[PDB]
Symmetry: C4
Subunit: 481 residues, 4 copies
């Protein structure tokens, strides 16, 4: 009867569900974190460069930034090897021990043109210069300083093979200038001095990139490093960093022939429900119409295919075209080739999420629960459209926050970051130490009221409007009895 068509479609998913759980552990090993954490804490937190305590994370002046380069990464990457002996002049070194350095770092940068901003008429004698915020129309393509080599010659975004980048305050694209690093300590050390001497950080500097990347021999894993040091147009500094691990070559002779052969099974397996599912979509137009459970049944397929192509289609031929392209003393473009990885990694996962809530309807046939799932199903039609009312007053304080503290407390800063903090307080966590220090009459009265209302309103609408309906429907499933 049905049970054959019940389990058969289940048996697919029931078997299909284990497939990805393999990929999880399989495509990404569990200790991968302790790869970063090391690789992280090497180049971030640990200047001994002097008694100076300030690490990468804590940084202000530009000259420190110099002392950072030539004082840490310069000693981070370029330095001796395990035996100290046996004369390696071809691969001269890597960091230490179990990780391989490949290529050579690339320093990328932006700048904005002189007098891009007109000082108000009054001060025009008082001070000569102005450099305003970074923007496309404000970007500077003009050649610069003593013009020799690359970093003294502007280049187009498309000229380099690199892409744009997100960043925190201002998004950046292409390069104003760049310098690829030498593979030897000395010359790298030799440039930086010769590099500082010309001072291309003078003013108006905005984006500053440092890009190298490395390989792990042991578990094969392949990781990239982008250090972006922003400069606000107001004179400060914002440090930031991005560490992305990646597996490049898809084939590990041990476990992958199980995985990759199951990989092709996966894209085949969905190809089944690709067409199988559309048949009801084309044949029954309104039968699937107006079902949230069903309206979500498509999304899993929507996303999966996106993942499907981009891995092979985008990134497979990539992997090929780097062989000697990637290995030579020259530095590859590889970053953008991993751009999709992050793009992929999450959207790989996001699907996996929904895959469970698929089973949510199915294999719970048993108790009154199956009915008592309709209970929770009933509520939202009130609340799903209701939550605005709260969320309206919820944005209230949010925007009330920005305008008030936004110039002093950090946590609020933008509006996009300060929307969260008024969550993080509801669960609780506290900058309230320095809220007073911000504005004595306000920070109290904002906070005091907010925790009062929001934490005593969330009570109100939710719980009751939760409570009632269930009491009704559980009594309603009693009033069919």
């Amino acid at each position: 009867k049905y049970l054959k068509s019940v389990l058969r479609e289940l048996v697919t998913y029931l078997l299909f569900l284990i497939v990805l759980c393999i990929l999880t552990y399989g495509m990404m090993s569990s200790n991968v974190y302790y790869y970063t954490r090391m690789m992280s804490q090497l180049f971030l937190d640990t200047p001994v460069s002097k008694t100076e305590k300030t690490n990468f994370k804590t940084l202000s002046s530009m000259e420190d930034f110099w002392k950072f380069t030539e004082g840490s990464l310069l000693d981070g990457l370029y330095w001796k090897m395990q035996p100290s002996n046996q004369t390696e002049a071809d691969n001269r070194s890597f960091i230490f021990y179990e990780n391989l350095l490949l290529g050579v770092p690339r320093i990328r940068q932006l700048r904005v043109r002189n007098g891009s901003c007109s000082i108000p008429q009054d001060l025009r004698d008082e001070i000569k210069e102005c450099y305003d915020v970074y923007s496309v129309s404000s970007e500077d393509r003009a050649p610069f300083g003593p013009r020799n080599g690359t970093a003294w010659i502007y280049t187009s975004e498309k000229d380099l093979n690199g892409s744009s980048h997100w960043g925190i305050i201002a998004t950046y694209s292409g390069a104003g200038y760049y310098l690829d690093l030498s593979r030897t300590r000395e010359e790298t050390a030799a440039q930086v001095a010769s590099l500082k001497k010309n001072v291309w950080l003078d003013r108006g500097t905005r984006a500053t990139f440092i890009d190298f990347s490395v390989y792990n021999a042991n578990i094969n894993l392949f990781c990239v490093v982008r250090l972006l040091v922003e400069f606000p147009a107001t004179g400060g500094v914002i440090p930031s960093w991005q560490f992305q691990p990646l597996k490049l070559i898809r084939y590990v002779t041990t476990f992958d022939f199980f995985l990759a052969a199951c990989e092709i099974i996966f894209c085949f397996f969905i190809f089944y429900y690709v067409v199988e599912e559309i048949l009801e979509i084309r044949i029954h137009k309104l039968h699937y119409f107006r079902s949230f459970w069903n309206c979500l049944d498509v999304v899993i397929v929507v996303l999966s295919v996106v993942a499907i192509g981009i891995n092979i289609y985008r990134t497979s031929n990539v992997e090929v075209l780097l062989q000697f392209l990637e290995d030579q003393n020259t530095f590859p473009n590889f970053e953008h080739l991993a751009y999709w990885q992050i793009q992929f990694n999450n959207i790989a996962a996001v699907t996996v999420f929904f895959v469970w809530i698929k089973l949510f309807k199915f294999i719970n046939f048993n108790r009154t629960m199956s009915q008592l799932s309709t209970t929770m199903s009933r509520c939202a039609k009130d609340l799903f459209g209701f939550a605005i009312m709260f969320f309206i007053i919820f944005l209230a304080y949010a925007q009330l926050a920005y305008l008030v503290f936004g110039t002093q407390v950090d946590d609020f800063s933008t509006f996009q970051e300060c929307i969260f903090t008024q969550f993080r307080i509801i669960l609780g966590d506290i900058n309230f130490a320095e809220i007073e220090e911000a504005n004595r009459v306000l920070g109290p009265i904002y906070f005091t009221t907010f925790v009062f209302f929001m934490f005593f309103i969330l009570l109100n609408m939710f719980l009751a409007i939760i409570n009632d309906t269930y009491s009704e429907v559980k009594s309603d499933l009693a009033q069919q009895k």
Copy 2:
């Protein structure tokens, strides 16, 4: 029909709402924070002055305070420029790079007269001296020390152009004495030594101000600095600081002619509803009477006008009268001219808040929500007058806290600060580390009971008295069905 008069009044507000959202982003840029954070962490947290770790925030002795002045700000403000060359003897320098120093710092101070307090009769031989807490009748106008220059000559509050100030423990007004700083490092460095040598910090010193201010060339922004170092009458020290950014000249040739021309639209736009709304106020006396929604409809106008004048009326002619007044080597009074800014900034924002809850009644016409808004509308008549009962027992622990821990734990300190902590614990956050260390039999028994009752009473009254009414009214809107 109505829909014409419905949308027309809406279209005003519906358009009016976007107007201010412009001002928000427009009148204050988003990165303004990263202006302070730099400008902050320069003069606060970062002595290298010796291996001494203690920054401004962590400070005790008076001689450190000296080592602070001549050791940090002295090197904070007065120091070299980007090229190090090209001979600037007119503007000799600013801090670094992208921020301009203007004027010159001013050190302001208070003191209290000798023997202002009568030691009890017994000890009168034991010790000679007494200086009691700062207060007006206890203030000292008497000339002091070797009398030369300004800071050895008292001045009246009105004599100087400055105003009073809030501060934490004691509010302060005017000046006992003052010294304007030199614009050169050396002479500033030269004074302080000559300044210490006379030791005008001897004892009884209470308020100590340091005031300079600076300008930002790049985005035009104009910021002021008040460092107040209090001295308790018990011998300690309280550091504190105030950083206020400001835009002064109202005209940025780029975006402002959009903003300022929309500014005049704004004050015009309210002028519409200024009179339009009073017509019903004068004609219908009792028709608007007794409506909370309507009773709040006035407040938005009440505040806005306050903001309206004070910006132009108070502060516009200000901006004018500083041109060469502000630029010359002499230091301006500008602080009070920004006093209203903070006064303004918030009260600008507070309105914006209410502007949303205006729409709260209007554009939700749709679901039973519009009715289900009457639900939440029903509750408070019980609770709004009820919340005292809690709040009564709520102050209980509060005042129970002060009398008990108030002499040992900091967090409680005053009553005004300790009213909050018994919130900050309900959401949760913890000094409970050192609560035991305060009083072993109490700190437990206060805390233990409090979290018990308050966190199990807030349950009680709220949720039920929330729950019921909705169950009734939702059934009442069912019992009109």
Copy 3:
């Protein structure tokens, strides 16, 4: 009618309530905290004694303890004065500036007798010595070391004028030995060297006290210092400290003649309701019987009288008998004379607490609230006797905690401290960082379950059993309608 007898009794309390609110602010000023915080952070957190970072709070070895004495307090108390000149050989100094040192410190100590514990028979050759935990029957009165001066001669508890003390692990009484400090730096510095040389800290040392005290000239306030450094019988060290501020002389010529004259009014005012209230107690035996509101009406009087005598009766004649007793170069006993202050301070406050909940019944006559106070009045008869059921399972985890983590995590430590942590987690706060590090299979499974049940049981019993009754009684006050 009643309103005359209604307000008259009220007018007493209604006026009486303000009386104590004066005492609060009056008997204890608001800035008193910033007295300690200074006076605290001088002798606790701030060795510069070398580059060694370890302060008082962080301490291990005994020799550090030596370097603490002679390296900090030795420089804490004994050191120069404001002018550095004018030859004070009578009062040679105080700390700095605004606080007076009086008397001279006293070092007090305990020790336990040799071989107080019998090592098991096997090891008896392996190692010679044993010293067990401190206890009365294990206490050592035997004279000790080279016997000269005080600290080499035992003394009885009663011989010294001092009392016992609480402390954390073991309570202590009297003295094994003691040394009063010199008033001069040098000799104090001279002893300690001569003191170390004899090494009376050898082993078995348990309690170590350091006691001096100081006076504040300015606001008159009088503070005492007890530093107890425990030694566990296992070789460690436990630092601890006690700072008690006090006002001694009851008369400040300015504000006290208002306060003290109102003080005598207070003890008179209660003397009114002392007898006035007993009349109904004697005449009506069962009329007051079985009323919680009334059953609490006595407690306020119970405690107040306790406070009444002990201030004058215990501590007034004290204040007198210290005049030249307290001032002379010899050190007074004053500590115990302040013992009652803390004993008093709280029990002064605890009353004040209840004084509000007195008004709780009275001046709320108005809304249905007065009836709706009976609502909350109804609940507890279920819950007040119920809370055991939870509290039973609540102790469960508590004692489950001790036996499990108690030997590794600090936070649990005793049972008396670990009863709190399972609150502090419910509100939330976290050692959960090192819970895993303690026991990997447990710390999770304890924690995981606990937050599950306890935080999902507190839901259960409370809210519903809260909700229902009110829904009933509010409907019951509706069913009298």
Copy 4:
């Protein structure tokens, strides 16, 4: 009547309950913690070895690990004695003062064989070497380096008397190599240099153990030390530590003859209910069937017996066979002999837990509570089987977390650790500082939704489905009235 058989069985448990409460305090004293905390903070947090701040907990490089051994523990264990005199050449020393060192430390280690992993074909010329993750089939038994002494000769797991170990990433068994330490500072110091010189840490090193142990003369307590320093296969380092206190000799002449004589009473007392309880189990098969209260009545016995034997049966003859076995200059195996202690300690406690909830049914006969216990008894039949639905969506985010942040934030790391964090956030505690820094578009949207749903779903199902039933049953016990 019943009351005789009611109390008699009670009187057993009612008396039995106190028995174990003795064991708690008795078998483990309260200050035992302050034994560890000292003994802990000696060898963990406190290098002065140079100005280098990095302690054991904060560690990266291998050479630091060397500087750790020879720089801390080398000075931790081996160093002078109280008198500095009286010539102890037999027991040469212990740490300090009140703790005895016995035996001598043992360094244990693992390694993995060369070329255990085949580098992909392409790079095979690029780099020569590979060492993959530790596993049994990947373990290396091959002899190593210059082969002399123990640590240059492999040994089997069974050859040594030691057992395997848990550890965090990889579990370890037996030894690749080992070296017992000398009892003298010098020779221990002498080896390490000679030890480093051979460099047996070269690469592929995984597990590194250091094992010594010590005795406490004073309270008799006997503690063991295992320091495991893991090496990831990716080049990092993971420090970790295990401190286990233990009492070995069961007889303390003072209090134990009360305890141990009550110990034999205990195992006798259960032997009563061992058989007494089985009689109803054999005679009534279905009468006990299907009672949760009764279904739990067996577990207490199930576990207790497990504890019963293993203490005497496993560990008693152990204690005997160490007398001169344990004392001699040679180092004993004692660790595994304490392996059961931890195994025992918890499972000793876990029983004690359930012992209370035994009384939960009994001595509450009194109020409607006894009936109102059936109320809470009613709920779970809905919820106990329900909690999956939540817990399903609960794992959702959990696994959604791993795949997303798992490569950057530490807190998530494995799946087994990241299941907790989504609790620790619900109660609240925050890495949300660096969540943004991980993935800007995700970390918000994960977090934002999660706190929304999970914290607004836990509301939903729980409270109502809690509320209703009680309202029904309390009305149902009213509808039997």
